[PDB]
Amino acid sequence: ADYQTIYTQIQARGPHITVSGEWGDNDRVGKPFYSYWLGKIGDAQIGPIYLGASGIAAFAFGSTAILIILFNMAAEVHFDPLQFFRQFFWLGLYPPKAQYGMGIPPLHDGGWWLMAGLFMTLSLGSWWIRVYSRARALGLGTHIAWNFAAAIFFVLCIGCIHPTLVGSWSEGVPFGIWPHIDWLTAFSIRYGNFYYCPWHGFSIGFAYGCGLLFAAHGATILAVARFGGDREIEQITDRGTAVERAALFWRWTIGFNATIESVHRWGWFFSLMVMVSASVGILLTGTFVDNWYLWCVKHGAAPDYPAYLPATPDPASLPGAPK
Amino acid sequence: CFEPPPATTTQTGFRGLSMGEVLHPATVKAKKERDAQYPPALAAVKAEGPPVSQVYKNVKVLGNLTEAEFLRTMTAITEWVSPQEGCTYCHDENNLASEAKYPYVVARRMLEMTRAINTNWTQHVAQTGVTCYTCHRGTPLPPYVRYLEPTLPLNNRETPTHVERVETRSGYVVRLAKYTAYSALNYDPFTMFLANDKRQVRVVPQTALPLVGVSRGKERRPLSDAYATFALMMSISDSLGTNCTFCHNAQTFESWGKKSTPQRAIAWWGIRMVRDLNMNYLAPLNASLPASRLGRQGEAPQADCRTCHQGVTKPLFGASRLKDYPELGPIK
Amino acid sequence: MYHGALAQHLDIAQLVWYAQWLVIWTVVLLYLRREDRREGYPLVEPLGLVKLAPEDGQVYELPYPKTFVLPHGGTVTVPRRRPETRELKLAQTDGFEGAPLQPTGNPLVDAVGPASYAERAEVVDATVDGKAKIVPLRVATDFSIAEGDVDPRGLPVVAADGVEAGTVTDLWVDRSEHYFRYLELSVAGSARTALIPLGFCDVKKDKIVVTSILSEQFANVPRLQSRDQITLREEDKVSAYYAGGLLYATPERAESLL
Amino acid sequence: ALLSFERKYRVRGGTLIGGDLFDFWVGPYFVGFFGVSAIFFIFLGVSLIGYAASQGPTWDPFAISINPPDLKYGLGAAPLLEGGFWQAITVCALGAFISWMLREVEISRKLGIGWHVPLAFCVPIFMFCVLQVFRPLLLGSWGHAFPYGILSHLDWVNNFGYQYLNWHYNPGHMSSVSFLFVNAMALGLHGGLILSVANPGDGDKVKTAEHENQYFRDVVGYSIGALSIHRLGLFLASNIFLTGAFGTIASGPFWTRGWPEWWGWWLDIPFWS
């Protein structure tokens, strides 16, 4: 076995490299330190950190959002610090419970929720241009930023675009561990079972394929570490036996293959498609489909099954039944 | 942390749909033993003499009965409701017609109520029926009742910790969670759905596309309604010791026909019956009860699914006394 | 009336369903699968002789060429004409088109099968600022072995047949990633140095186990042009040598494990 | 037929069984003995699919469903129409998957590369066994396994989940979902990074490993490095099932209540009850 794929046997230390960016080279802060155990499964060097305007903008807005959430959570346990730790996962900040439509809700019923939402959104925008601008300062493509943009767009969809399109803030995702989880069933129940939403299926298909691809890709590169396949940039510009063998492994297995560069396009596209497909689904939900199961029945897609115990007429539609 | 195998499983849907009951034998055995304490029926007595309407002085509900029949009823009522307290819980030792003690008048309406259950709600209690024991389980205060706010513990025979006490506000989220099978759902399904008939529990549309006129802005029910009925269903599932699959094929929660089981229909009638009982029998009893029985808003204790079922899909595993006590219903 | 309804049993979501599938297959078929063809294409046959004009499918499956402008001068354009010049000493086991080839000589030296190397550039991979990236510690003197790990310099190398085959004289490090990639070792009894990729190295505290090749086979490990740097092709030549051993070092390794 | 660089690798040997007898290609496909068993099991499998489907109501691909037996048949053979087909097809699937994996080790040996990929492919084969074999063994009927239908298998995932009131609270599930999400993220980040270095665009020049690590250090203060991101990727992906398996196996055999209630171990500690 090649033990180098499991962990680094002999770590190396050496002077810290700094690649100069078109700007902000002075805004890198902290002194690098090295971790020996980290260095067995990774790169040992932790830090420094770039610290631009946007990074701080993000921390500013995010902490505002986190504080708005935490104080509302604490208010839910009338500020008892011990019950706060005990009940933390059950505590949340909820959108309006009553129907105000698009009206700005009272603070005690989703106003605070709305404001945490604004400040998180601003934090995501700030972090986004950090992710983008860092790439141009170092003279790199904006690939990551576009993938990240899709992720942010999906959050906006479940957070406020979908509430806007149906016209009720009551449909936002709550903040909280279990509470954000509870929303998923409430939403799915309201809209007729998300298993019958094709864009759910697409999202899952790509999400699972990200599992398939990264397991497959990660395993492939490790299988060709002896020939240097981890040095992927120079294997793009000067094909070595590593990617030759990697390509022939797959070609002989599934009948076709990629290049060392294009597999990364595959992976980038699949991860992007998780969020693009999820977004289309939410945009269509509520606005143009009310019950995803009935929509599948309408179009002849739903499976059907014989009764096991006897079919049961809705009692509410028998004559003279109470309401 | 965990429960040791094996698990008893049942089937409630077509093969392949993973619908049925998943029960822990230990737990079922414990609940079976607890429910087996149901006292056996008293021996039958033969009807002799006049109706008790002409012998005793203050009998308005049970006047049809003869003396031996009637007294059999009274010792059964004592066995089911106040075994440890005895006849004197409802009566003055030296005036059995005195209504001076509040349990007397409540017991009178409880008689009318449980007779009503066994006559008007056969769509839910069927041939099994209910007796006083079904709810009371041998104490004057039934172990499982509800106020207009959630209380802990669910069994009022256990003593509350400081946080569990309703006046401790830091423990609200936990009081509420334990009513909804430990979920963080932020709704009290009892006051929303079981205390009265003001709210509809159905939330999911019966058309594929959104109907113009009910689908935008303030025309829309808020999403909270969906959370709320999820909560009610969690709470129902817990109260019967079962899961959604007992009643639903999750493929379409909103559909009946092949997508529902007969138990879902019975559960539907149970909602209606619990609403009748609360609105028309149990809630008005705040006039007749002492303040120590009322909740923090002057409400009497009311019933939910648990009051009868106590974690079993049939109360007391289907035990019945119906034919043994005709006086309790159904009445022609 | 219904939000999303269109004329005669159409609705918006039904159209988007069709649109989405179209978008997917467009990206997969017209874009990704062509990107997959930037290497190894056009394919080769039992001599495709049509030298006057190209066959239509070979033009359609290719993307428009792209050019990488390399960081230390140069450009590379893919796809391109890149045929294998070297004489491969292999022979056809049969006439069938996809029958395997047998090695005619000694497959480790002749560099066939798992011992094949790509025809990469005969240039030394460089750091971001121009220096030779993969250098041994005698040159990279500001690089150390980390506190806690075996220092292999001095330890013996034991080959697959339990025979001491040489002594580790040095470690070659990746100055761009801070990562040791080869050990240098003296080959006992032949007064030469040889590089081993660490991936073929079982690093113990008293020895370095190497199961890929036999002790005698350390003689013919490819030699470098220079003492203190290595080219990308040489790295391929060296790495491939040991990989060849996994299948060829003994007769029994090629035949069925059971 | 052959990639420009392919012919030098296309040598004999590296098989596990059969030596020369099955050591050859057909088009691009390596065969081997496990190629032959794969095709056998595939043929048998999709034959049994097609027979079973014709005895059913419809031919609409979305609505076909080959289902396991009723629970009453426990772990025995069931009539072919009422679960037998499902039993036969499951065996053919396992034959095909294991063949496919072993085919991959043979291809790996011939190229003289690591067996990491067939290794990685074991974990989805394992997870399939958790759902169709081990968990039905522990519960005692094949009828607890999932049906073979595009949409019908979702109805099984659905009801299975709701048998425990809110499956989201399953701690094995929480772990599994978290790996699914972060794995998808990391692949975006990894693929994004690689292309951003090789494709800055505008005629600007290709960058370098140093640029790779510099980018992540700058934005999040740490960069795990080239080789390690691949090791982490395989680790993250694999733990989707490796941890989720526990949450699946627990549900039923080791837990019959709802999954939210399981968190009583925390909520109901007396010290803060």
Ligand code: BCB
């Ligand atoms: C415990 C939970 C499970 C689950 C939960 C689940 C959900 C919630 C959803 C799916 C979905 C999907 N699942 Mg399912 N599933 C599937 C296959 C499928 C596909 C129909 C679809 C998308 C798959 C995908 O893109 O993956 C990534 C793999 C890729 C991208 C490579 C291409 C795969 C190719 C599309 C597979 C197609 C398979 C064929 C239709 C079946 C084989 C046909 C035969 C005759 C050769 C197989 C083959 C298995 C096996 C053998 O175990 C399986 C088990 C499970 N699924 C478990 C039961 N799955 C989605 C769907 O849309 O279904 C309607 C969906 O929403």
Ligand code: BCB
């Ligand atoms: C009972 C209810 C269910 C449900 C309800 C549900 C809903 C309501 C929605 C989904 C959605 C999705 N579901 Mg589904 N689901 C899925 C899988 C998925 C996902 C692939 C997909 C997209 C969500 C995502 O990846 O977000 C992970 C990524 C996120 C959330 C982006 C985060 C990026 C962000 C920039 C991160 C930044 C955070 C900050 C750093 C922190 C700051 C916060 C502080 C300040 C407070 C599987 C595999 C299954 C199975 C096996 O059963 C399943 C079943 C269910 N889902 C049941 C049917 N699901 C979504 C979808 O696709 O709908 C069409 C969706 O909207």
Ligand code: BCB
């Ligand atoms: C209402 C019910 C729900 C539910 C019920 C549920 C159950 C019951 C189980 C899961 C499981 C899982 N759920 Mg979950 N779920 C998930 C995500 C997930 C997955 C991460 C995880 C594993 C799925 C699996 O086992 O694949 C299985 C995939 C397999 C077996 C792949 C087989 C591949 C095979 C080897 C090869 C197949 C090849 C093809 C046939 C060949 C054909 C190809 C062509 C090209 C030739 C998300 C992200 C969400 C969201 C967003 O809400 C969600 C909500 C729900 N889940 C709802 C709450 N979920 C599983 C789990 O791990 O639980 C802890 C699980 O058992």
Ligand SMILES: C/C=C1/c2cc3[nH]c4c(c3C)C(=O)[C@H](C(=O)OC)c4c3nc(cc4[nH]c(cc(n2)[C@@H]1C)c(C(C)=O)c4C)[C@@H](C)[C@@H]3CCC(=O)OC/C=C(/C)CCC[C@H](C)CCC[C@H](C)CCCC(C)C
């Ligand atoms: C399919 C597509 C996937 C995807 C894709 C992508 N996702 C990306 C990118 C792409 C392309 C980025 O480039 C960006 C990034 O930067 O990566 C390094 C990023 C992000 N995705 C995060 C979280 C996330 N992605 C999720 C999901 C999906 N994403 C889906 C699955 C989920 C789920 C599943 O819920 C979560 C929770 C954050 C780490 C980050 C934003 C931080 C922020 O918006 O500021 C918010 C401001 C704060 C103050 C919060 C501080 C705490 C957080 C943890 C941040 C701490 C970092 C800090 C620098 C630590 C320093 C310590 C140091 C000294 C040692």
Ligand SMILES: C/C=C1/c2cc3[nH]c4c(c3C)C(=O)[C@H](C(=O)OC)c4c3nc(cc4[nH]c(cc(n2)[C@@H]1C)c(C(C)=O)c4C)[C@@H](C)[C@@H]3CCC(=O)OC/C=C(\C)CCC[C@H](C)CCC[C@H](C)CCCC(C)C
């Ligand atoms: C965390 C681990 C991840 C992971 C990892 C890896 N995944 C790998 C590898 C690794 C490493 C490979 O090396 C291998 C491969 O070669 O890559 C191209 C592979 C593969 N992953 C496939 C499918 C896949 N991966 C999934 C998931 C994950 N993978 C998770 C995420 C999922 C889902 C559902 O998520 C699917 C559907 C095939 C494409 C391929 C097998 C081909 C095969 O096996 O050929 C042999 C079999 C056939 C060609 C068909 C056989 C038909 C049978 C006999 C009859 C049908 C019965 C069937 C049960 C009916 C079901 C009906 C259905 C509607 C319910």
Ligand SMILES: CC(C)=CCC/C(C)=C/CC/C(C)=C/CC/C(C)=C/CC/C(C)=C/CC/C(C)=C/CC/C(C)=C/CC1=C(C)C(=O)c2ccccc2C1=O
């Ligand atoms: C007819 C007959 C008797 C034949 C005999 C021979 C025989 C056994 C034939 C088998 C026939 C069969 C069953 C064929 C089916 C083939 C199969 C299973 C195809 C499935 C293909 C699918 C859907 C894959 C999903 C994954 C996916 C999206 C891949 C796209 C990108 C690719 C090709 C990734 C593979 C790949 C990865 C993962 C790298 O990391 C890598 C690194 C460097 C260079 C190349 C690569 C590379 O190609």
Ligand code: HEC
């Ligand atoms: C409350 C739960 C009661 C217990 C315990 C006992 N009795 Fe009772 N009794 C109760 C009510 C509400 C009534 C009125 C019945 C009606 O139909 O309106 C009665 C009535 C009697 C009578 C009739 C006397 C009269 O009103 O003239 C008798 C003789 C009587 N009860 C006796 C009795 C005995 C012996 C009991 C212990 C075995 C006993 N009762 C318990 C309410 C309750």
Ligand code: HEC
């Ligand atoms: C559930 C559907 C019940 C059935 C059947 C019967 N009772 Fe009941 N009872 C029930 C509740 C929820 C309450 C309120 C809690 C309380 O303690 O008041 C009661 C109350 C009584 C009382 C008053 C006891 C007291 O407050 O100390 C009595 C005397 C009583 N109930 C008697 C009684 C009898 C005799 C019944 C059968 C004829 C009977 N109850 C049925 C719930 C339910």
Ligand code: HEC
């Ligand atoms: C039987 C004892 C049930 C169990 C267990 C669960 N549900 Fe239920 N549900 C039941 C009934 C009788 C009804 C109709 C109530 C009425 O008054 O009309 C419902 C309703 C729902 C709905 C709403 C469907 C609609 O038409 O809007 C949902 C979404 C629902 N139920 C979900 C659900 C879940 C998730 C359960 C397990 C937690 C569950 N139910 C259990 C009866 C019974």
Ligand code: HEC
């Ligand atoms: C006492 C007045 C009850 C209350 C309150 C509720 N239920 Fe009930 N239920 C009761 C009886 C006596 C029976 C008869 C058992 C029999 O053999 O039929 C039932 C039955 C059910 C069932 C049928 C279960 C089965 O296995 O067939 C269900 C599903 C049920 N009950 C549900 C239910 C719900 C949801 C309730 C609160 C709304 C509820 N019941 C209250 C007595 C009483």
Ligand SMILES: CC(C)=CCC/C(C)=C/C=C/C(C)=C/C=C/C(C)=C/C=C\C=C(C)\C=C\C=C(/C)CC/C=C(/C)CCCC(C)C
């Ligand atoms: C016109 C104006 C007024 C209205 C528009 C405002 C606007 C754009 C609102 C947008 C709102 C949006 C996008 C809301 C989306 C909310 C979502 C998706 C919430 C989802 C999950 C929230 C979770 C998990 C939060 C949990 C909170 C906590 C754990 C406490 C906070 C503390 C932390 C340390 C956070 C850690 C989170 C995690 C990494 C562990």
Ligand SMILES: CCCCCCCCCCCC[N+](C)(C)[O-]
């Ligand atoms: C995961 C859910 C996938 C459901 C697939 C249903 C697609 C319905 C669209 C079918 C095409 C329209 N038409 C005309 C054929 O009915």
Ligand SMILES: CCCCCCCCCCCC[N+](C)(C)[O-]
């Ligand atoms: C449900 C998600 C859909 C994902 C689509 C990914 C399918 C990849 C198809 C590979 C096609 C191979 N080939 C050679 C035929 O082009």
Ligand SMILES: CCCCCCCCCCCC[N+](C)(C)[O-]
């Ligand atoms: C229409 C749905 C199709 C789902 C995606 C199927 C993936 C196709 C892979 C089969 C191609 C095999 N081949 C020819 C490339 O060897």
Ligand SMILES: [Fe+3]
């Ligand atoms: Fe990579």
